[PDB]
Structure formats: structure tokens, C-alpha cells
């Protein structure tokens, strides 16, 4: 539902993250709405329309 | 996910003497099987030694080797080994590890080793009671002979007396091929040979059922007017028992032969071994050859 | 030949300028056509183009459909190109509800003609079929054009997206609890010899086994009832000369982690499929077993 | 002997879109990102007397 | 930079007509006995194997072993032959008697039937490129036709043979030669037929002994059905050394038939010209 | 769906429109792909969100 490609392409501000638990545990236990995970390199960010 | 690796590095965690490394260097371009593919593996998984088991059966070892993936050995370093997974259709250099003589143009199969000569060749990397046992690469006729001997022993074992079974196993286990003598180790009869025996019996039953009268009568009719060494040696195997064909129907003959071909393929498959290499070159000392990989 | 010639590593296919650029540079002549980069110049996959009538193109609009060539037994079209979904109609393996759904989807004259031709003759099903590969394109029209790969991965023009292979859920088959890292996929057609007529089962099998004999032994273990039916027909019904209890054809290889479950939408109807994300095709021929 | 009196080739004539009078009906524009475009549209607002 | 190629030099003087004939074949499949870098024109084609007392099946066996290659370029003093590699697509010429379709699987066969390059005693005999079902049909029909060799006296047998000879494939009809010449059968086809009949005869008597022992144990209820089928077949009609000999003979006669029993695809087609004489297809080996 | 409020707010180009037939006739006889008609004054354009 979110535009993940826009997040990947646009510039970002770097911060030190402070998850209390492991980041994958926070993802797997559904700490957040609107999660996306992918492994390796996913080329879908390259197809602009 | 993680794409399958083509280059595999193997490291021995046992310490190696200079003699061990010297032995390893000789093995470049040989075929070594591995159970699983990773970029970096331990030497325990390398080779056929891991499957040696109290069961000792040759048939089960043949079954296990069929499912391992084959790799060629690239050049060696200190305490490291590099293995390469070949691809179908490309051209490769391969090392003749076993004593079997190769020839130009024949097809090669991978098969568990069977002992030969004095049986003192086993110097291959004995370290920490792990041993580098490698399969044999043999030409098609020898593999066909080996499988045929095993299946014939299995079929003959049924209902025959124990002592004559021993005698038959003694005479069948030895093989002379291309001016060399080999002998099959541990020809155990068990479930693995039993399933092959069952399929062979089924295929023979279907072949006997399908075959037309023309096919059955061809040999009998030929002997009435032909005469040759091939025929007389051929008819000695058969049970001892003008006219016109009682029934002519080419369509029925065609369909019947079509099914009979499928049944013959079913019977053939259990002694056939998959061709892994086809050779067209040979070092005149028979130690190495260049082959095309397939399978 | 000299030492520098031997030492020289081969030319990069990407740093040499192509033939058209070479000619234009040689004459120093401009052209309207953009020429600096040639598309598909580095596609290692082998593709073919197929024409197919409008009625048959349904569920093959999305990329990833398996494409089969069927024989009509006639000289006017000679051959038709159909998908695995259409064979879903004839297969006994597919459930009643899915059969009704994808029978309502293919309500066109061409698809019904394909079914009539398939059931009409006396041959077994696999003798009438030839597998082409997987499709990844569509240009719609009264006659539609499909491009199918027959050796390689499935991807679009810039490789910016890789396509999966879609198998309907009733046809999907596995025989191992924990999957091997590398999986081979096979097509199975198996015949049940009941009284009136043979009912064929159609499956797509994902397995870690590459050896033929071990695979066929596992298959004979799984399909014992059909072998019993074959022998029973051989006994009860002479002058019927059946061949085979089943055929096995290899087509492809993929990684176990790429396997997923998904659904397909067509005319607001949902069909459920198994999805092989990075599937690459590698076709074999039909090998028969008893 | 046989004689060849010259060899001739087709002197093809060139046609351009902007030179044809049919181009008068067109308003031709070049757009390099056209392949990325999905659809284009114009909107009109009318109030009646 | 060049591609790898095999050079062939003609050991005969060539006229302009001959080289003009050769360049017509600039995509034909030429069989070659050995993978070798430089060869003489005698090694081209099947003419080297042709024999008076041998026939189709021995040629099939020999073609199994030969190396297939495509003629790539024709020049003065030499010919360029390219050996295809597995998994790549190539252009081949339809020198066979049958038209092709997209998706066809082709296999190579000895020619059965214009002549090409008649030199002093050598001819360029190219093989047949045929779709697989047609090859299976041809093999079966020829094998059956050889099986009727002893019965040729009767008119019914002659009619059956004539029906077997005439074969029709898509839009093409042709007749295959009779493997019986001068009322006699060639030694290779004789060996094939004898092997088939021997396998049948040996299996018929050998099967029951082992089936009745093994079916008692059977957990799959199929071997009992096999026993019953054998009993029905029988009702419609020994030293251990002899048993061993009969089993070994059964298996050795089985191996004699593998050339006829199975065949392998070499090309799969995906393109055809309206000029259909040529097509583009991927190579399988 | 088309957001007509954006057209209603954003600046527009003045054009002499030319419908051969009456505007309401061309709209009623379904000449245009997408159409919005309202009477009086519609408050929709005022609630920017």
C-alpha cells in the first residue's frame, strides 16, 4: 500500500537506530504497520512509470 | 534465494603432512562426489567414504552414488581444495583414476569401486580414520556387465539350493573386460536388489504376454532353411520341440510392437547406467582423456 | 601467434562498439535511429513467437503460463497452442469446483474445439502433446501473439523484473518433507484404466531427485493403483493393447525458497496457483514408465 | 563477344513527415521519456451563459 | 576474432560448378567420424560406410557414434565446418523428405531413397533429418517388414508388406525400401530380428519360475496378477548352469536391440521460413 | 477517478470553445469519455485535504 520504490529512490537522512529487541524480531512480531522485507537485490525500484 | 554455487572450496581441519598434500596434487582433474553444495565445505563430506556402512552391500552403495552431485577438482593449494561443477555440453579434461582402460569414442559411467589386483592401492589420504574413497569411471560395457551380473545373481538366488547359490555367486562375481580382471565386492542380496528383481519379473511377464506369434515363430522358422554358427549357438538355449501364417494383420503387429518397445525399455533401464562423459581424446599412457560432460 | 597475443585477456563484449555504430563511425554519418545501445543484446534466454486465436488466450495474459502444442488430427490448423489450464478441464486430478470455474472461463469456440479434438481420437493424451515452454508477453487482438522462452529465465526487456511459473493448485505435487536446496520440476501424465475409458491424471512435480531410476521408483511407489489398473485391463480386456501407465517429462529447475502460493485473477474470478519465482526452463522429452 | 553497357541502381527518393502537407494537421513534439509514460490527459472547464 | 571451426580440404580438383554446388549446402548437417581439426573430403558424409552386404540398422548404429557438424562457409581450397554445442540455436537445412513445424523434435536417420558432388568415386551422402514420431514409425515398420522375410511366398504376406512400405506423414506420402533383396535378408537385420525373437522366446519360459516364487511374498498384489496372466497365456497353448546361461543370453540379446529400441532428439525447432527448406532450431546432444 | 476539484482550483488557460452542437446536447449524447456536471455552487472544491 505504501510506495516502497519512492522510499528506496529518494534521499534519506541517516540516524542511529535503537530497536530494543532484534530488528527481525520486531518485524516478525509485528511492531509496525506496513512492513516489507526482501533478500539480496530486488530490481523493482528501477522501473519508473 | 542463494543461487547454487559452481565453485566449491574444501578445507581439511585435520593437519596435513607434506606427503598428504603431495598425494592431493596428483588428483587434479579427477571426479569427486559431494552430498551438498556450499561455497566452503569440510572434508568429511568429500568422497564416497561417508556411506561405507555395516550393511556393506554393493547395490545400496551404487544407489547412494547415483544421487550425489559430481564435481571436477581444480588445482590445489596448501590445506585447500577447489572443486568445479561441470555443465552439460561443455568440454573437460578428466583423470583416469582407476585401472580400467579407456578408448576413443566410448561412453563413461560412474560406479562404486570394485577391487583389483593385489588390493594394495588404498594409500589415498588416510587421516583421522577418514579415507579419500573415489568412485570409478568406467566405459559402458563394463557397467552393463556389472549390473547384469548383480541382477542375474539376484534372480538365480530364488529357490536355488544354498551351496549352488554360493557356486553361482563365485563364478559370476568375476569379470574379464578389455584384457583385465575385476571382481565385485560384497554382492549382498537384499531389498535393494529385490525391487529390481520385481520390476524385471514384471517386465518379462509383459514381454511374454505381448509378443506376437510371428515374433515367437521367427527363430523356429529360420532354423529350417538357414545354418550358421550364430544360429546353432543360438538355438542350443531353446527348449526342443510347409505352412502359411495363420493370421496376418499389419496394424495389430504395429501396435503390439509399439507396446513391446516400451516394455523392453522398462527392462533395459534397470541395467543401463546414465552416461556422464563421452570421450574423444586419450593420453597414450591412458592416464587422462578429454570428454564432453552430460547429465 | 606471440606471447602478447596469448597473454591478452579476451575483449569485453560490452566495451566494443557494435556493428551499426562501427559503420556510422567509419563513414562519420548521422542517423535518426538511436543506435548506441542494442536491446536484448545480452539476453541469454532463447525465445520464440507464436500466434494463437483470441478464444484460447485466457489466464495466459499474465506471464508465466506453460505453453503446450497439441495435434488436431487435421490439415487445416494442424497444430494448436494451449495452456496447462485448459488441460485442467480434462484432467481427473482437478477438483469439481475448480473444473467448473475454469470451464466457465474457457467458453469460446476455439477452446471447445481443442477439447473435442483431444477426446476424439484413439491415442493416449501424451502422444498428442508437445511442450514448448513458458510465455512472457501478450499482444491482444483477434489473433494474439505470444512469445515463449524455451531455454532460460523469464524476464522483461531490461531484466528489471523476473517472472515466475504458475501451476494450478490441484496439479501441484511434492513427495519430500524438507525440500532440497535445488529442485527439479517434472510434468506427469498418468492413466487410470477403468471400464469405459481411460481417465488421465495431470501433475507438475517438484523434486530434488535428478536420477531417472530413483525418480521412477518413487513414482511407481506413489502410483501403485494405476499400475494395478493397467495390469487388470491387460488381463480382462485382450485385443486392447495399452502402453505405459504414465509418462514423465522434465522441464526446468528452481530453488526451494522460490516456491510460493498465490492466486490469479481473470474477469473477477480467482484461481489459486503455486508460484515458482525464479524458474528457468530446461525441456526434456516424454519418458514412459510402467 | 557480349558487351555490358553500364550497370544502374535505384536512386531512391526520401520522404519526411514534416515536409508533407498532411503535417499541417499535426503538432509534432519529441519527448524522450515517452516510453515511461502510461497515459496523458487534458481537462476542460466550461460555464454556460 | 574468429569462431572455432574445422577445416576440410578436398583432395580432388574442383570446377566452378562443383564449388557453386557446395555453397548451396551452407547450412546442412554433415556427419564426421572423429572430432579432428583438419580432415580430408573422404571423411565427409556417409559414403565411407556404404556397403553391399550391410543395410539400414548398421548405418543407424554408426550414425549414433559419428560427430554432427554444420557446414559454415565455403571457400576455394577448403571448407569450414562448425561443430554445434549443447544449448545454443543454429540454422539447419531441411534435406529430409518431410516438412517441419514449430516445436518439432528432430532426429537424424540414414537416407532411405538430386545427387550432390559426384567426384571420381566419392559422393556427399547427407543423412535424413526427420521428426521423431516419423522415425519411430519407420523403425517399427521396417523391423516388422523384415520379420515377414521367410513367409514372402504367399500373396497375403506380399500385400501386408506392400501396405507396410507405403507410409504417409503430413502432406507427404512415400515408400520405404524393402530390407529383403534377392529373396534374402541382410545379416544386420537378420541379427536384429533374431535378437527380438530370442528375447521373446527366452522370457516366455524363464518368467514363470521366478514369478511364482516372488509373488507369494508380494505386498503390491501385482505379481500375482502377472502369474495369472502367464497361466492364461500357457493355457492358450534343468541344471543351474543352463539357467545361468539362459539368463545371461536373455540379457545379451536384450542389449543387441538398444539401437532400434530407443532414439535421441538432436534438434528442437522454433522457427520456419515460408521457404521452409531451412529452419532455426536449438541443438540437443 | 478524476478529481475535478483540482481542475476547479488550479489556474486555467482561456480558450474559445467550439462545440458544433449545444454543449448539453453533446454531453447528454455521451460525446466525452468522462464528464461531471453540477448546478448552482458546489462546496466540494473548498475542503482541501
Curated annotation (Swiss-Prot), chains A, F:
Homomultimer. Makes the hexons and eleven out of twelve pentons. Interacts with triplex proteins 1/TRX1 and 2/TRX2; adjacent capsomers are linked together in groups of three by triplexes, heterotrimeric complexes composed of one molecule of TRX1 and two molecules of TRX2. Interacts with scaffold protein; this interaction allows efficient MCP transport to the host nucleus. Interacts with capsid vertex component 2/CVC2. Interacts with the small capsomere-interacting protein/SCP. Belongs to the herpesviridae major capsid protein family. It is found in: Virion; Host nucleus. This is Major capsid protein. Self-assembles to form an icosahedral capsid with a T=16 symmetry, about 200 nm in diameter, and consisting of 150 hexons and 12 pentons (total of 162 capsomers). Hexons form the edges and faces of the capsid and are each composed of six MCP molecules. In contrast, one penton is found at each of the 12 vertices. Eleven of the pentons are MCP pentamers, while the last vertex is occupied by the portal complex. It comes from the Viruses. Signal peptide: none annotated.
Curated annotation (Swiss-Prot), chain B:
Belongs to the herpesviridae TRX2 protein family. Keywords: Capsid protein, Host nucleus, Virion. The lineage of its organism: Viruses, Duplodnaviria, Heunggongvirae, Peploviricota, Herviviricetes. GO terms for molecular function: structural molecule activity. This is Triplex capsid protein 2. Interacts with TRX1 and major capisd protein/MCP. One of its GO terms (cellular component) is host cell nucleus. The keyword Nucleotidyltransferase does not apply. Structural component of the T=16 icosahedral capsid. The capsid is composed of pentamers and hexamers of major capsid protein/MCP, which are linked together by heterotrimers called triplexes. These triplexes are formed by a single molecule of triplex protein 1/TRX1 and two copies of triplex protein 2/TRX2. Additionally, TRX1 is required for efficient transport of TRX2 to the nucleus, which is the site of capsid assembly. It is found in: Virion; Host nucleus. It holds the Pfam family Herpes_V23. It comes from the Viruses.
Swiss-Prot record, chain C:
GO terms for molecular function: DNA binding. One of its GO terms (biological process) is viral capsid assembly. Disulfide bonds: none annotated. InterPro entries: Herpes_1 (IPR004999). Keywords: Capsid protein, Host nucleus, Virion. It comes from the Viruses. GO terms for cellular component: host cell nucleus; viral capsid. Signal peptide: none annotated. Its main location: virion. It is found in: Virion; Host nucleus. Belongs to the herpesviridae TRX1 protein family. Structural component of the T=16 icosahedral capsid. The capsid is composed of pentamers and hexamers of major capsid protein/MCP, which are linked together by heterotrimers called triplexes. These triplexes are formed by a single molecule of triplex protein 1/TRX1 and two copies of triplex protein 2/TRX2. Additionally, TRX1 is required for efficient transport of TRX2 to the nucleus, which is the site of capsid assembly. Interacts with TRX2, MCP and capsid vertex component 2/CVC2. This is Triplex capsid protein 1.
UniProtKB/Swiss-Prot annotation, chain E:
The keyword Manganese does not apply. It is found in: Virion; Host nucleus. Keywords: Capsid protein, Host nucleus, Virion. The keyword Ubl conjugation does not apply. GO terms for cellular component: host cell nucleus; viral capsid. Interacts with TRX1 and major capisd protein/MCP. Belongs to the herpesviridae TRX2 protein family. This is Triplex capsid protein 2. It comes from Human cytomegalovirus (strain AD169).
